[PDB]
Amino acid sequence: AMENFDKVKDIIVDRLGVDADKVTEDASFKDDLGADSLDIAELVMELEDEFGTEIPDEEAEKINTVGDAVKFINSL
Template identity: 65%
Template structure:
């Protein structure tokens, strides 16, 4: 008896730990952890409060000077330049991770 052929999802969609997806996810998690370290150091906040959706000013209590120091710390840590226009749009931890991932 023949069985109908079942359509298959792309390899990475079927398996959580496929090669490229797993590598990319690990890279982003490493970037998040490094960004988190800079935030904890520069803002003096509890590491548990640093989540991807945490906002620097509203949730983590950063003032304008601390925000500038945070951006400079990220530039030093990751070897990137964050122009003022871009820095003004980086308001959350995830936005910082995304900027670094896209500009490193």
């Protein structure tokens, strides 16, 4: 699951512009990464492109941390 983690991290660092050292699995988007709902929408959409998966808001609203986003990938 290290693969999916790094892929999620990549998106957060070079596409959302967040420092890599802040991206840990327990990091909160709104509290730690300064990423709002629009940014999470961008993350989620980018994850649909990188895995050919569809993520409805029902599951996108359940992601408040890095581990949440990761966890979800590993479920596919």
